[PDB]
Design a binder for this molecule. Structure first.
Ligand SMILES: [Mg+2]
Ligand SMILES: [Mg+2]
Ligand SMILES: [Mg+2]
Ligand SMILES: [Mg+2]
Ligand SMILES: [Mg+2]
Ligand SMILES: [Mg+2]
Ligand SMILES: [Mg+2]
Ligand SMILES: [Mg+2]
Ligand SMILES: [Mg+2]
Ligand SMILES: [Mg+2]
Ligand SMILES: [Mg+2]
Ligand SMILES: [Mg+2]
Ligand SMILES: [Mg+2]
Ligand SMILES: [Mg+2]
Ligand SMILES: [Mg+2]
Ligand SMILES: [Mg+2]
Ligand SMILES: [Mg+2]
Ligand SMILES: [Mg+2]
Ligand SMILES: [Mg+2]
Ligand SMILES: [Mg+2]
Ligand SMILES: [Mg+2]
Ligand SMILES: [Mg+2]
Ligand SMILES: [Mg+2]
Ligand SMILES: [Mg+2]
Ligand SMILES: [Mg+2]
Ligand SMILES: [Mg+2]
Ligand SMILES: [Mg+2]
Ligand SMILES: [Mg+2]
Ligand SMILES: [Mg+2]
Ligand SMILES: [Mg+2]
Ligand SMILES: [Mg+2]
Ligand SMILES: [Mg+2]
Ligand SMILES: [Mg+2]
Ligand SMILES: [Mg+2]
Ligand SMILES: [Mg+2]
Ligand SMILES: [Mg+2]
Ligand SMILES: [Mg+2]
Ligand SMILES: [Mg+2]
Ligand SMILES: [Mg+2]
Ligand SMILES: [Mg+2]
Ligand SMILES: [Mg+2]
Ligand SMILES: [Mg+2]
Lengths: 386, 197, 114
RNA sequence: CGUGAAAUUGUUGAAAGGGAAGGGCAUUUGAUCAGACAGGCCAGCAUCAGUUUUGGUGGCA
RNA sequence: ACUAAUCGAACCAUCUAGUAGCUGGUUCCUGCCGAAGUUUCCCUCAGGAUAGCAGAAGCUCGUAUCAGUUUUAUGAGGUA
RNA sequence: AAGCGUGUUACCUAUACUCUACCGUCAGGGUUGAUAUGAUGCCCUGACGAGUAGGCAGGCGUGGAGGUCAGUGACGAAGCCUAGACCGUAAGGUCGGGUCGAACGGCCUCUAGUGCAGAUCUUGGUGGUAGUAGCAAAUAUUCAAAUGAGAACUUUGAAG
RNA sequence: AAGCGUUCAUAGCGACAUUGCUUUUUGAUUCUUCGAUGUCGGCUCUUCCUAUCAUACCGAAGCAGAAUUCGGUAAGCGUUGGAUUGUUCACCCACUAAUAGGGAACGUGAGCUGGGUUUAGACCGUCGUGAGACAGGUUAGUUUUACCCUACUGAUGAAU
RNA sequence: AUUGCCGCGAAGCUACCAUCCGCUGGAUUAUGGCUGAACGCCUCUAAGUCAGAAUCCAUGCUAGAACGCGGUGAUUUCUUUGCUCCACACAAUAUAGAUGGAUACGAAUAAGGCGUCCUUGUGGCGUCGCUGAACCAUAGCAGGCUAGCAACGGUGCACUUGGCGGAAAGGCCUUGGGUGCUUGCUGGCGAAUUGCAAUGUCAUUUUGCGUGGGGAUAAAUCAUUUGUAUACGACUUAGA
């Protein structure tokens, strides 16, 4: 008979299967539509998630009880050093989908990207791209021929970039390589831009700007095998329940004589690819700048890094994107930040944001000091030997 | 008599063409069907869209991935019709189905190959004048086929190159016909004409 | 005999996921390997060319024990012993019937070919 | 510890294998096997007979 | 309730292969023939006896006596 | 229309119908002064063949008994194995090859504790399950030496 | 469609008749199960139906506005918290956009629970000479097994 | 003192008990319309057609076919002389089934193709179809040897010039000469006995093996290690 009391289903059926993503680098499944009028630009950018901290800012939102009044907002910092352009790929249109016709690499590849082509780098002869780089020998005729093919064909052009992971407090040493669609100009202009940028670095301030709404594409934090209670949010069974209570009591009616695909069951939780959208950029900071953490109202000559460093990450020596709120994935996780897929004019977007203050107290405890000098002023002198 | 028979699917009725090809395959003739997107189904577009939606709603309840697969592309809608006219769970049916290729548009190497029609299955011949009919391209797009635009663009490109080839062929055919007409009324031609040639 | 064994990366080299480290079996086999080797160079066979040409395990008769179960029931608690044998060997280093037509065709090919 | 079956099992060899397997009729392929030259095997044509099937044409009411 | 893991009459042996209109099983091949679930009676209604349907053995004769049929003639009937 | 009503033909195929053969059954016949010795024999002619329960008939197989083959057999009986062979519609029978070691058959008759897939069948043997469930109460073990083929577990010392 | 509806059959209704649909009611049957398909209700959880309570877009009104009512497409999305009762059912309080109706072996007991029925103890009332009876009341009363196959959820993986 | 108890307690986990974030296009239903006959009027409907729902399909999001696919990197000798390509030589392996040629406009069908001319068009005129029953090819020991005539064509094979073709291009078009054949025509010679028929063997696939001719000179896994991962596998890092 009928359910006897209506309740919404537990969990979303479109985020299925709740399995481990095939890679730690979540893949961009859609790039922004290409306006051939605008200049040639990258559509995404690669960064590493560092941590989170709070900001204070005035709120420009008429009609709200907090208009022109300060608010405290959590933000996520992503360490985004420049990425190196090391390749270009041409994509032709086909009645079966998009097909990569050919890929042209730069003459020189760094070790951090050459590592990405090895599983056992210390034992290897490091032969990668050795014969390819001889196609630049006399005048790069083969390189120019392949580029000409991309000019002729290739309705879509994506540039191959890799991160400079050596500029990060990460032990990995092996760079992340990704295809970033290249929007703007003709196909020929896209190829010319990519060729001009081989071996060249592209900064994050040439791709993103403050107040822009962006999307985060990253693999979520893993939790291994999870029971249905926390994996799906189902009700905990009563206390008197024989043979366990962190379960679903009925996994199905008698007919169909099968368990439905839509029944909540235990399995892998986390480590899922997620594409979260509409995250407002609060700051595009430059690493070669003391006072990253400073604002126009603070003037405290401090960088974005918290005292004692970002917990489990380290210090931010590079450029960085400060984005409102939380993004999927954990610290150290490679994240792709992508430009908005649509023009958002919701008046939460288009709101110019001006930070009044950035918290840099320790995140290794209940940190009560923004800077060591502020700590010295409050504490006074101590006994620790000079 | 051909080793491979290429059927232009334009303006054919899907089920009557399907039965023809199914008999050809089972009788051992290799068939390639091109321009699947230009196939016709008798009846209004709404009727055939309603029929596909009725087809869409049937799926294995407990796992939709083990159910009736609903292929959206026109060549696959043709293939599904041709299955069910072929005993496809047998080895003989598998060997019959391996003699068939169905494409949207005309890809290489069939661009420069003769396309035939099946008058037995042509809409212009079978269907009563005034009867409403559906085109499989717009049906496929309405049910989720993604590649109508790329197919149309590539077909325009193929048609342009083909028209240019035909202009050269027509010019040579003109010259050949003139030389054969001039050779007529000669002694060898008159003897040939007395033999029906 | 692997149903509900655990999975290991050490099965990779054999194209499998289920592999174990049966120390007692290995000790018994390597004891027999030692004996057969001793026999081989006792016979005069060369060491470096020896390979295991035959190795066979058979069920020996079972040794019976008992195990005590709930509600005063007794069940068998059996050993499954083995007969093992192995051999090590040195590695070692149509008239056609033709008919008259077929014969004539062969002759015809020979007089029109050279 | 005579012989030493079956169930069940190891090894070797052969073979087949997209949600069972096994079976019937028929034939292909592989493997394997019997007998006969004092007619054994497989066929072809002709003239007939029995039973049929499909054409051509003639004479009458 | 308990009376040795046994209790609305323990346990052991024998009478005892206790009786069962009820359940289960009932072991080679081929050939020919080939059913009944209906009549009457029965503390009869899950069973029997009885007649019928069936097989087998034949016997007395040798194309009759006949006949799930019609025709002709002649009855009878109270349903549509 | 490959839909509906209707009409016309052609065509497809049942273990049914026609003809032929072979098997069997039933029936009706033929055949003795050599039937060119099988008279429960041989031969001629016609028709017939579904089958539970059940009836009957002719056969096949097993233990033992009388008779016979002056049968087989340590130069290998019986038993067992054998995608080797042959006969019979079949029950079955026979032969080859391997194993084996001491007895056993054919035919005419006699006799029965005489033929198994089933009985939650009896006894015994054996699988899949499966190297699976498990070997988780009683707070707890550790270092070294000695012994020994082998020591988490034995001994001694130290310690907890 | 006789009437009601201020006049006006059909805005909204609708007598006398009459045609159906449904299988969440209950009867009727006794086909399946008695070498056993776990038995009421609740809990949990998924999905389906539409005869749509709410939300979308609409048509009609005895639609001025507001509030309502009748009707369409439509099941995409929701459809609650409680007092008493084992309850199904019900009833009241309250919130709400709304507190629509049903199915899935009267979905779901190797998922639970065990208040109910329906074992054995015991009391009462009526009945019975009595033993005892009661779809009458009351109280106490063991809820077993998954490691197999499939399905499902996740996880490896030969061959290219 | 089976974590003795109490206060605080970082890290991790975690809460509508915390914070962030949850897209925009098409086609439709009901309905309302347009033009408009049927039915000289009317009519949202018949042919055409507009707008239009929490509907549907896409965009977007999740997985990625473990028998769907593409691009790209490097591919093992001083190592029982290995690997790869090419060529020719023999072996083996098979065949969902060669047996003259898969012979390319596009569009309409109540219309078209071809040709011709002009005033280059939705043009004039002529002509065609009513099937490929076509066109092409096609004679020669399964196609031999050899002599000429006529023409300078046809066709094969390699070498070669240039151009085009990315949907799955892997093919199409050409240039130049060379080396063959030519049945366009006329000759001379050969064939027999496979016995009156027996596919009477002529094809294209795969893998070996040998020879001679170019070419290149790695990784992966286990073990160790990390913890962005984790039941185990797996994942993700590091290590001359
Ligand atoms: Mg409901
Ligand atoms: Mg309990
Ligand atoms: Mg975050
Ligand atoms: Mg912290
Ligand atoms: Mg299915
Ligand atoms: Mg064509
Ligand atoms: Mg889809
Ligand atoms: Mg286990
Ligand atoms: Mg025990
Ligand atoms: Mg013995
Ligand atoms: Mg013995
Ligand atoms: Mg056996
Ligand atoms: Mg399988
Ligand atoms: Mg079969
Ligand atoms: Mg004849
Ligand atoms: Mg008894
Ligand atoms: Mg009969
Ligand atoms: Mg009586
Ligand atoms: Mg009975
Ligand atoms: Mg009467
Ligand atoms: Mg009467
Ligand atoms: Mg008809
Ligand atoms: Mg019979
Ligand atoms: Mg005997
Ligand atoms: Mg013997
Ligand atoms: Mg056998
Ligand atoms: Mg003896
Ligand atoms: Mg007996
Ligand atoms: Mg038995
Ligand atoms: Mg039986
Ligand atoms: Mg275990
Ligand atoms: Mg049961
Ligand atoms: Mg409805
Ligand atoms: Mg129920
Ligand atoms: Mg239970
Ligand atoms: Mg259950
Ligand atoms: Mg109770
Ligand atoms: Mg289990
Ligand atoms: Mg369980
Ligand atoms: Mg109008
Ligand atoms: Mg995806
Ligand atoms: Mg894959």
């Amino acid at each position: 008979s009928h359910r006897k009391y209506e309740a919404p289903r537990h969990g979303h059926l479109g985020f299925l299967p709740r399995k481990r993503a095939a890679s730690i680098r979540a893949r961009v499944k859609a790039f922004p539509k290409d306006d051939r009028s605008k200049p040639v630009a990258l559509t995404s950018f690669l960064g590493y998630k560092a941590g989170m901290t709070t900001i204070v800012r005035d709120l420009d939102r008429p009609g709200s009880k907090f208009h022109k009044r300060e608010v405290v907002e959590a933000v996520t910092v992503v360490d985004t050093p420049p990425v190196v352009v090391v390749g270009v790929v041409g994509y032709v249109e086909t009645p079966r989908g998009l097909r990569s016709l050919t890929t042209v690499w730069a003459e020189h590849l760094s070790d951090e990207v050459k590592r990405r082509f090895y599983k056992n780098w210390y034992k290897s002869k490091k032969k990668a791209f050795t014969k390819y780089s001889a196609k630049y020998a006399q005048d790069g005729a083969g390189i120019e021929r392949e580029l000409a093919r991309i000019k002729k064909y290739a309705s879509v052009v994506r540039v191959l970039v890799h991160t400079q992971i050596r500029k990060t407090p990460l032990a990995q040493k092996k760079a992340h390589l990704a295809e970033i669609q290249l929007n703007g100009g003709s196909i020929s202009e896209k190829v010319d831009w990519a060729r001009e940028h081989f071996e060249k670095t592209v900064a994050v301030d040439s791709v993103f700007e403050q107040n822009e709404m962006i999307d985060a594409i990253a693999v979520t934090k893993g939790h291994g095998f999870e029971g249905v209670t926390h994996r799906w949010g189902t009700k905990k069974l009563p206390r008197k329940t024989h043979r366990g209570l962190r379960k679903v009591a009925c996994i199905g009616a008698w007919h169909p004589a099968h368990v439905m695909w839509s029944v909540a069951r235990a399995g892998q939780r986390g480590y899922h690819s997620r594409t979260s959208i509409n995250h407002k950029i609060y700051r595009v900071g430059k690493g070669d700048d003391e006072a990253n953490g400073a604002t126009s109202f603070d003037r405290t000559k401090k960088t974005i890094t918290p005292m004692g460093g970002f917990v489990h990450y380290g210090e931010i020596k590079n450029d960085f994107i400060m984005v409102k709120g939380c993004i999927p994935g954990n610290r150290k996780r490679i994240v792709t930040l992508r430009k908005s897929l649509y023009t958002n004019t919701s008046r939460k977007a288009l709101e110019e944001v001006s930070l009044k203050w950035i918290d840099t107290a320790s995140k290794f405890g209940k940190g009560r000091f923004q800077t060591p000098a502020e700590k010295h002023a409050f504490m006074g002198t101590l006994k620790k030997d000079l | 008599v051909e080793p491979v028979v290429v059927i232009d699917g334009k303006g054919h009725l899907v089920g009557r063409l399907a039965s023809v090809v199914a008999k050809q395959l089972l009788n051992g003739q290799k068939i390639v069907v091109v321009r699947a997107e230009e196939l016709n189904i008798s009846g209004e577009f709404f009727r055939n869209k309603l029929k596909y939606h009725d087809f869409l709603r049937k799926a294995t309840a407990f796992n939709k991935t083990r159910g009736p697969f609903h292929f959206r592309a026109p060549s696959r809608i043709f293939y599904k019709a041709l299955r069910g006219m072929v005993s496809h769970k047998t080895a003989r049916g598998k060997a019959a189905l391996e003699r068939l290729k169905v494409f949207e548009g005309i890809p290489p190497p069939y661009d420069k190959k003769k396309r035939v029609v099946v008058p037995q299955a042509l809409r212009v011949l079978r269907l009563k004048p005034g009867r409403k009919y559906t085109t499989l391209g717009k049906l496929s797009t309405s049910v989720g086929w993604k590649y109508e635009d790329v197919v149309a663009k590539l077909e325009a490109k193929r048609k342009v190159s083909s028209a240019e080839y035909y202009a050269k062929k027509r010019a040579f055919t003109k010259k050949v016909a003139s030389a054969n007409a001039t050779a007529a009324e000669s002694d060898v031609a008159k003897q040939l004409a007395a033999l029906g040639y | 005999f692997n149903s509900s064994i655990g999975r290991t990366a050490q099965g990779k080299e054999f194209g499998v996921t289920k592999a174990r480290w049966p120390a007692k079996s290995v000790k018994f086999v390597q004891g027999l390997l030692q004996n057969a080797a001793a026999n081989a160079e006792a016979k005069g066979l060369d060491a470096t060319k020896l390979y295991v040409s035959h190795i066979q395990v058979n069920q020996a008769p079972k040794q019976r024990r008992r195990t005590y179960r709930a509600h005063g029931r007794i069940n068998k608690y059996e050993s499954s012993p083995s007969h093992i044998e192995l051999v090590v060997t040195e590695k070692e280093e149509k008239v056609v019937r033709l008919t008259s037509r077929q014969r004539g065709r062969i002759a015809a090919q020979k007089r029109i070919a050279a």
